[PDB]
Amino acid sequence: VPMGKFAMYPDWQPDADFIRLAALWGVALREPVTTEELASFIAYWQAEGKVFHHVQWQQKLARSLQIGRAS
Amino acid sequence: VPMGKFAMYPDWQPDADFIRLAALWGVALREPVTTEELASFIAYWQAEGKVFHHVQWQQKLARSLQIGRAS
Amino acid sequence: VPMGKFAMYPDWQPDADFIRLAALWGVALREPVTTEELASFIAYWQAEGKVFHHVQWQQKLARSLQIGRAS
Amino acid sequence: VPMGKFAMYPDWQPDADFIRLAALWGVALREPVTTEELASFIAYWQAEGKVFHHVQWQQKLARSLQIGRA
Amino acid sequence: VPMGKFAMYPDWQPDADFIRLAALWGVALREPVTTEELASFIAYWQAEGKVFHHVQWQQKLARSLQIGRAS
DNA sequence: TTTTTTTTTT
């Protein structure tokens, strides 16, 4: 992944231990991140064009899965 | 088809491959979009006046159909 | 209380006086800060790189909890 | 009013006609300034250490309340 | 209007072509100068007590409006 | 002259 802030992009992936991190940020995920969930996240934010650090992007991904899976 | 964010408008349409996209975002559609579902979505969001990129609109349409057809 | 501006770092804590100050600043919290809320706050601002006085860091944490918990 | 350039301090207060000043400077305030809003402001800038004239401090409070109430 | 350096005073105004100047100095004002922004600028600098040439005052206004409207 | 973290018709 790039250093510093950057816009979301198609082959981006969170860290292997992403679920661990999400737990540490108060989001307990039962099942792993599916290819579809990630593709949808990336599409949305790639369009938006805002820029963030890798770890902030992962925080956005966790918050998004939490809302996504409540429904 | 405008570039950038835009408010929804009456002759708006999702891409021709919309059904495959929806699948890639984790929305499996067994029926194609109807002119009535699309008019309903457009009328709602046109009034609202909120602005989004084309791809984000298409995600809103996918989510909206999922919910709508579940009922 | 720590002195001078400083970047956010992993072991940072707002003092035991934090809930008190938050109330003096118009943010009334029912329950204490969770390890997770804090971890999440730290991760975000540590990546951001910005530098602040302790009290200022505390106000940002208060504002964040207020928003966070409104959901 | 406090004189010269100065650092923010606990007992600081804007003028009684602060509301109308804020309007003159393009910040239309529906309600008056609360105790907590002021304590929050004062804490922030007291830590920061920067020094300003009283009126400038009042302009900073006006800009801040605007942002804060949105 | 006064020649040479002078302290800011309540009735001060910039030139009628102030928008064109501001563009020459790199500040493109999508909107012109409001009476309020002006009073705000005057109260600030009148308090500050510094003296400047008319054209220097006009540069301070222009830089100011740039920063003030960047929000 | 510079205080202001935030995907979801239901």
Numbering used by the authors:
A (entry chain B), B (entry chain D), C (entry chain A), E (entry chain E): 84 to 154
D (entry chain C): 84 to 153
Quote the authors verbatim.
Except for the dT10 ssDNA ligand, there are five molecules that display as a C-shaped helical assembly in one asymmetry unit. The protomers are similar to one other, having a root mean square deviation for the Cα atoms of no more than 0.3 Å; each protomer contains a three-helix bundle that has the α3 helix flanked by the α1 and α2 helixes. The five molecules are mediated through dimeric interfaces between each two adjacent subunits. Taking the A and B interface as an example, the interaction interface is mediated mainly through the α2 helix in subunit A and the L1 loop and the α1 and α3 helixes in subunit B using hydrogen bonds and hydrophobic residues. The ssDNA binds in a hydrophobic and positively charged cavity at the junction between different subunits of the DnaT84–153, with each protomer binding to a 2-base unit using the α2 and α3 helixes. The phosphodiester backbone is recognised mainly by Lys133, Lys143, and Arg146 through hydrogen bonds, while the 2-thymine-base unit is stabilised through the hydrophobic centre formed by Phe124, Tyr127, Trp128, Phe135, Arg146, Ile150 and Gly151. The Tyr127 and Ile150 stack against the two bases from each side of the two bases directly. Each base of the 2 bases stacks against the other, and all of the 5 DnaT84–153 subunits bind to the 2 bases in a similar way. The 2.83 Å DnaT84–153–dT10 complex structure showed a unique ssDNA binding mode that is different from any of the known RNA binding motifs.
The second primosome is the oriC-independent PriA primosome, which requires PriA to recognise the n′-pas (primosome assembly site) and initiate the primosome assembly. In general, the PriA binds to n′-pas while assisted by the auxiliary PriB, PriC, DnaT, to recruit the DnaB, DnaC and DnaG. In summary, the ssDNA binding protein DnaT, the N-terminal end of which is crucial for PriB binding, exists as a trimer in solution. Biochemical and structural information shows that the DnaT can cooperatively bind to ssDNA to form rod-like nucleoprotein filaments, which indicate that the DnaT-ssDNA complex might function as a scaffold during primosome assembly.
